[PDB]
Copies of this chain bind each other. A is one copy, B any other.
Amino acid sequence: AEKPKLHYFNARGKMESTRWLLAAAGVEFEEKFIKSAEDLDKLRNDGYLMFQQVPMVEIDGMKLVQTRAILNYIASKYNLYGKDIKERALIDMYIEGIADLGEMILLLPVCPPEEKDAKLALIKEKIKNRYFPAFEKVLKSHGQDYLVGNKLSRADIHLVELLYYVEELDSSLISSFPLLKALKTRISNLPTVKKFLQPGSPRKPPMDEKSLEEARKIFRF
């Protein structure tokens, strides 16, 4: 029927976690790229964006805005949000930790040059002493293949996506965390995820200086 339609600019940004989740669920989607501020304004004027911002996803008759709203709906619709509220609580706690670290890395390129060095150092420190030990500890606690309920959930998907970004940053960071390395492997081999990691998929590359300045002009940041 109507495949979900993602509205954003041709880049990772705040739309990438959604592309990863849909793909891992095996859902085909279409993207409608915003190429100019004129494109954004038309969406605004047609009353498509509740808060005049993107990401925006057309799905099940709704024009959903706000990253967490979009991700929560999709995760629930495809049974990737756990089996009950206690499982959702563990999932939420884990993925909000992932969102904090992920945001830091996302904004690194937009960080003021005189601060870049400090920021990068703080991030690596947090990765090694706060975030990775926390997730490695969860996996060691139950010895299971998945983070929550011994079954695949959005938590494993979001985590593995973040592990790829950390690798791009510094591949040595994951060294002292074997369980995390193991999970990265298992999840990457699931048919849906393997197809998404392969050349030619909707997966997006890191942002280049040239494309980054047009984005900044359109969105103002």
A50 within 8 A of B: yes
A52, A60, A66: most-surrounded residue (chain B CB, <10 A)? A66
Bound CA–CA A215/B50 (angstroms) = 35
Bound CA–CA A69/B131 (angstroms) = 17
A134 within 8 A of B: yes
Taking CB atoms, residues of chain B closer than 8 Å to A73 are 85, 88-89, 92
A101 nearest CB neighbor, chain B only: B51
Do A89 and B68 touch across chains, with their CB atoms under 8 A apart? no
Bound CA–CA A88/B86 (angstroms) = 17
Interface size, chain A (Cβ < 8 Å): 27
A105 within 8 A of B: no
Do A69 and B51 touch across chains, with their CB atoms under 8 A apart? no
Taking CB atoms, residues of chain B closer than 8 Å to A88 are 72-73, 76
Do B66 and A93 touch across chains, with their CB atoms under 8 A apart? yes
Q: Which residues of A93-138 are within 8 A (CB) of B?
A: 93, 96-97, 100, 130-131, 134
Bound CA–CA A96/B51 (angstroms) = 10
Q: A85-B73, A85-B77, A88-B72 are in contact. Are A96 and B134 (CB under 8 A)?
A: no
- Interface pairs A-B: 7 shortest CB-CB: A69-B92, A66-B96, A69-B93, A73-B89, A76-B85, A66-B93, A51-B97
